[PDB]
Write a protein that binds this ligand. Structure first.
Ligand SMILES: CCCCCCCCCCCCCCCCCC(=O)OC[C@H](CO[C@@H]1O[C@H](CO[C@H]2O[C@H](CO)[C@H](O)[C@H](O)[C@H]2O)[C@H](O)[C@H](O)[C@H]1O)OC(=O)CCCCCCCCCCCCCCCCC
Ligand code: CLA
Ligand code: CLA
Ligand code: CLA
Ligand code: CLA
Ligand code: CLA
Ligand code: CLA
Ligand code: CLA
Ligand code: CLA
Ligand SMILES: CC1=C(/C=C/C(C)=C/C=C/C(C)=C/C=C/C=C(C)/C=C/C=C(C)/C=C/C2=C(C)CCCC2(C)C)C(C)(C)CCC1
Lengths: 73, 336
């Protein structure tokens, strides 16, 4: 079964040190291997200071959220 | 030669030249990098032929810009200046080809320069330059402006054309011997000889008449007539306080002859110590090497100009036009 969020669904990042903390991204993929500490892959339209668009998060660092509306990050 | 590839489609891309700007506008650093690398043709997409194309065409476009600026100066002198009052009596009237509006009380900027003229006193020495050149009529200044504008258009057309005339096979810009010989013999030698001719044939009679006090149209439209045996520079025009323009014309003739002779001896290979400079010749065949060398040469020449324009007086009344001489020195020192 799918351990993490569904592929393509929007997840709100809960990692305090993340550039996208409390903002939402799209789940690119989730690693089903139980040995992966940070399986979920989330991409965001806003590049961070290092011009990086995607990142890897653990199952406890992302929660399911609705897609951003107009003017929402 | 193929001009079907010049289209305005790339105008709206805003960053096509730099591959690092492909991910357009993710931050404001992208805007700043676009501006910073706009004219760094070496790191831009393309080839060495394209780099040469851009360098030469940009040089021509800047030439057109300078010609436009000179034409604007001539137009301001012709129509928005007190050059007539200054010519008849330079001492009483300060040069001014600059007028300001009366928008918000801004008319206060204009100051008394003549009875019928109020404006901003210019400090570029353009009036003295015109007087030395023999320009004494609004028609002459107007035609100088027209020539400058025509030169601007010609240079703009040349830049636009050369952006496509020069192909990847183009190599005329690497012919350093030909470039240097042409510049030394024609641009400098023939140029100086031709300007000496211009002085002798136009400026000398007009300047002599102006010194005497004659302002007759027929006269305005016998070298060494007034110059004594005194060494040039040892005796200044008593009525103008500057080196005799006939001495200046003789100087330009001699300089042109010397430049032509140098070019001809180089052509004949009379210069022998090629090996002492061969290392530099091989090393410095680069855009940035040539740019650095030329910038240093022109900096030194600008400093020498700053010193000489004041210490050695050659323009009429520029010696007594204290703001003009000071501003010229300071400007050319800063450019140096
Ligand atoms: C002074 C500075 C002079 C610089 C040196 C000039 C060099 C001379 C060029 C020789 C003539 C030339 O090669 O002649 C041809 C030139 C260059 O043409 C080139 O012509 C080439 C001809 O190609 C053909 O060439 C062969 C022809 O046999 C083969 O057919 C070949 O396959 C084919 O490619 C290509 O077409 C190139 O694309 C094309 O650029 O023709 C052009 O386009 C003519 C360009 C003239 C521009 C003049 C601009 C002046 C504007 C002043 C405006 C003032 C107006 C007053 C306004 C007042 C109002 C305020
Ligand atoms: C013949 C003259 C010449 C030529 C052909 C070049 C060519 C080049 N220079 Mg430049 N350079 C020149 C003169 C020249 N330079 C001079 C005189 C200096 C000394 C200051 C420099 C110093 C210099 C540096 C330090 C660098 C270059 C670089 C470059 C490259 C492009 C830079 C660019 O895109 O700028 C685009 C930016 C602009 C056009 C804007 C510049 C605006 C400045 C701040 C001046 C503002 C003046 C203005 C009048 C202020 C008052 C107005 C105000 C009141 C409103 C290119 C190879 C860069 C490089 O890496 O090259 C490989 C680079 O880093 N140049
Ligand atoms: C080096 C170039 C140069 C510079 C710095 C100036 C500067 C000036 N010119 Mg101009 N001028 C130039 C070239 C130049 N000119 C040329 C080549 C010509 C024709 C040969 C003229 C013909 C001309 C005339 C006929 C007049 C000026 C005037 C002026 C002054 C006011 C301009 C104005 O109100 O703009 C207004 C602002 C704009 C046009 C906006 C520009 C940008 C938008 C997009 C257009 C100003 C000091 C005026 C002046 O001195 O009045 C007392 C004036 O009457 N100029
Ligand atoms: C709207 C403003 C304006 C405009 C359009 C012009 C236009 C012109 N002035 Mg200038 N001028 C101005 C304001 C202006 N002036 C002011 C406020 C003064 C003080 C009274 C002058 C005093 C003045 C004199 C005395 C002369 C000119 C001249 C000229 C011509 C020179 C060409 C040129 O600018 O090349 C482009 C040149 C530059 C961009 C120079 C950039 C670098 C400068 C020299 C740095 C110096 C400091 C700077 C002015 C201020 C920095 C601080 C500031 C940001 C707060 C041209 C018609 C000359 C001329 O021949 O006129 C016919 C001339 O002799 N002007
Ligand atoms: C720095 C100034 C400069 C330089 C070094 C050159 C150099 C060149 N131009 Mg010229 N050119 C210039 C300004 C300049 N141009 C300007 C301002 C214009 C606009 C009128 C032109 C318009 C122009 C055209 C239309 C053509 C050249 C051509 C040439 C070549 C010389 C052959 C020739 O006809 O020689 C005799 C002089 C060479 C690439 C020709 C070329 O490349 O033919 C293969 C050519 O067709 N040029
Ligand atoms: C026939 C006479 C003649 C004349 C009048 C000129 C004049 C000029 N050439 Mg030259 N040039 C000539 C023949 C001539 N060229 C020939 C026969 C060739 C070989 C094809 C070249 C190849 C050539 C190249 C490759 C370049 C020039 C450039 C220039 C300009 C440099 C000015 C400069 O940097 O001042 C400096 C002054 C100050 C810093 C002040 C100037 C307009 C340069 C340029 O930018 O042209 C647009 C340039 O890159 N010329
Ligand atoms: C026909 C001969 C002739 C004449 C009449 C002049 C006249 C002039 N030259 Mg000279 N000049 C000449 C040939 C001539 N030059 C030649 C062949 C060269 C070599 C290319 C130079 C290189 C040259 C330079 C580099 C400079 C002048 C300058 C001058 C001016 C001031 C010189 C001065 O006060 O000297 C004073 C006179 C003497 C010390 C007497 C000695 C005379 C000889 C050596 C004996 C003056 C217009 C200067 C200038 O333009 O200043 C604005 C300047 O900087 N000239
Ligand atoms: C270090 C000593 C030194 C000194 C004091 C001078 C002094 C002078 N040189 Mg220079 N020069 C030097 C070294 C020096 N040069 C070297 C080592 C070379 C080549 C080996 C040259 C080649 C050279 C040329 C070809 C010309 C000068 C000219 C000039 C005059 C000033 C610039 C000028 O008028 O620009 C006007 C000329 C230009 C703006 C043209 C610039 C040259 C082109 C565009 C550069 C092309 C670069 C190349 C294609 C890059 C390819 C790279 C790739 C293959 C990797 C002045 C007499 C000019 C002159 O009138 O001489 C009498 C001139 O035409 N010099
Ligand atoms: C930002 C660039 C800049 C600007 C805005 C100006 C502005 C000015 N310069 Mg120029 N100048 C510059 C760079 C610049 N200069 C540089 C880099 C040099 C060093 C080469 C000079 C050297 C210079 C001289 C020697 C003279 C000017 C003069 C002038 C004034 C009249 C413009 C004119 O029509 O000259 C047209 C140009 C001339 C009349 C002089 C031609 C000089 C020849 C080409 C010398 C060649 C020597 C070389 C070995 C060959 C004006 C204030 C003239 C002035 O002050 O008049 C009152 C003047 O006599 N400038
Ligand atoms: C702008 C300015 C300036 C100035 C400049 C100048 C002024 C320069 C010079 C210029 C010049 C003044 C140039 C000259 C030129 C000339 C020439 C280039 C000539 C040539 C000749 C020829 C080409 C010849 C021809 C012929 C004939 C006549 C016919 C037959 C025979 C024969 C072929 C020989 C400066 C730098 C300060 C910078 C700033 C501003």
């Amino acid at each position: 079964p799918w351990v993490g969020p569904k592929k393509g669904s929007w997840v709100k990042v809960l990692r305090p040190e993340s550039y996208w903390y409390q903002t939402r991204g799209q789940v690119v993929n989730v690693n089903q291997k139980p040995e992966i500490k940070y399986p979920v892959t989330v991409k965001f339209d806003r590049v961070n200071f290092s011009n990086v668009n995607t990142n890897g998060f653990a199952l406890w660092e992302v929660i399911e959220a609705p897609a951003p509306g107009p003017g929402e990050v | 030669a193929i001009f079907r590839y010049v289209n305005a489609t790339l105008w709206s891309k805003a960053g096509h030249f730099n591959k690092a700007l492909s991910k357009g506008a993710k931050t404001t650093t992208w805007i700043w990098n676009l501006h910073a690398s706009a004219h760094d043709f070496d790191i831009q997409q393309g080839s060495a032929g394209l780099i040469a194309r851009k360098v030469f065409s940009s040089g021509l476009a800047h030439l057109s810009l300078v010609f436009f600026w000179l034409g604007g100066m001539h137009f301001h002198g012709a129509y928005l200046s007190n050059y007539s009052a200054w010519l008849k009596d330079p001492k009483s009237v300060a040069p001014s080809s600059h007028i300001a509006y009366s928008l918000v009380g801004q008319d206060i900027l204009n100051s008394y320069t003549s009875q019928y003229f109020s404006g901003i006193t210019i400090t570029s020495g353009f009036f003295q330059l015109y007087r030395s050149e023999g320009i004494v009529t609004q028609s002459q200044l107007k035609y100088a402006c027209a020539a400058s504008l025509i030169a601007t258009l010609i240079c703009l057309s040349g830049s636009y054309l050369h952006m496509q005339l020069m192909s990847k096979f183009t190599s005329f810009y690497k012919k350093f011997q030909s470039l240097s010989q042409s510049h030394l013999i024609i641009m400098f030698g023939f140029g100086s000889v031709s300007f000496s001719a211009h002085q002798i044939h136009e400026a000398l009679p007009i300047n002599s008449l102006l010194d005497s006090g004659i302002w007759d149209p027929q006269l305005f439209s016998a070298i060494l007539l007034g110059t004594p045996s005194a060494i040039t520079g040892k005796l200044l025009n008593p009525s103008t306080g500057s080196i005799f323009l006939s001495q200046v014309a003789a100087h330009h003739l001699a300089v042109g002859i010397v430049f032509i002779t140098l070019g001809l001896i180089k052509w004949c290979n009379l210069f022998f110590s090629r090996n002492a400079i061969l290392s530099l010749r091989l090393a410095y065949m680069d855009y940035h090497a040539q740019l650095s060398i030329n910038l240093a040469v022109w900096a030194s020449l600008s400093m020498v100009a700053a010193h000489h324009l004041t210490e050695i007086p050659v323009y009429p009344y520029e010696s007594t036009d204290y703001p003009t001489v000071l501003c010229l020195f300071v400007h050319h020192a800063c450019l140096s």
